[PDB]
């Protein structure tokens, strides 16, 4: 379970798929502005190993840290695609949706 990588679990948005078996993921965190005391997004890039090349630009993915980095910049692997771009499945009902509208009514399967 141990790992030399700092970020163990992180969610991000895929912003690039031009490297072989590697997805470029943009991860945002809330950082407190000390003077304004307002939280602002701070983004960082992570390379994630994607053995099956299933990532599409724009989908939300969950990254898991590798035991040791497999490359200079590849320290994580694709653990799960949370929200496939344009093919979201509502986790609350399990039905496909398009934005804030259902594509299949939850009443279909009772």
């Amino acid at each position: 379970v141990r790992s030399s990588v700092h970020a163990r679990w992180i969610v991000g948005k895929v912003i690039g798929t031009k490297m072989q078996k590697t997805a470029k993921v943009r991860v945002t965190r809330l950082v407190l502005d000390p003077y304004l005391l307002k939280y602002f997004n701070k983004r960082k890039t992570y390379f994630a190993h994607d053995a099956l090349q299933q990532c599409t630009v724009g989908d939300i993915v969950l990254l898991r840290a590798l035991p040791v980095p497999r490359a200079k910049h590849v320290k994580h692997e694709l653990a799960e695609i949370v929200f496939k771009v344009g093919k979201v499945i509502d986790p609350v009902t399990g039905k496909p949706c398009a934005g804030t509208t259902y594509l299949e009514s939850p009443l279909s399967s009772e």
Partner: protein, 58 residues
């Protein structure tokens, strides 16, 4: 919780919900539709928050 990643998403599904990702790999889904923001804070405190005893000891 300065070291916990918090990411927001707008208008991706028909209803609002929270989802927590734990270090073990477990995921905790919390449906928050119809609940007030105070009921949401009290809910997540009960299932994933440290109790007053654990905080006093620290």
């Amino acid at each position: 919780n300065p070291w916990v990643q918090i990411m927001m998403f707008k208008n991706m599904t028909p209803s609002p919900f929270l989802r927590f990702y734990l270090d073990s790999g477990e995921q905790v889904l919390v449906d928050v539709e119809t609940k007030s923001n105070k009921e949401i804070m009290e809910h997540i405190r009960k299932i994933l928050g440290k109790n007053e005893e654990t905080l006093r000891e620290e």
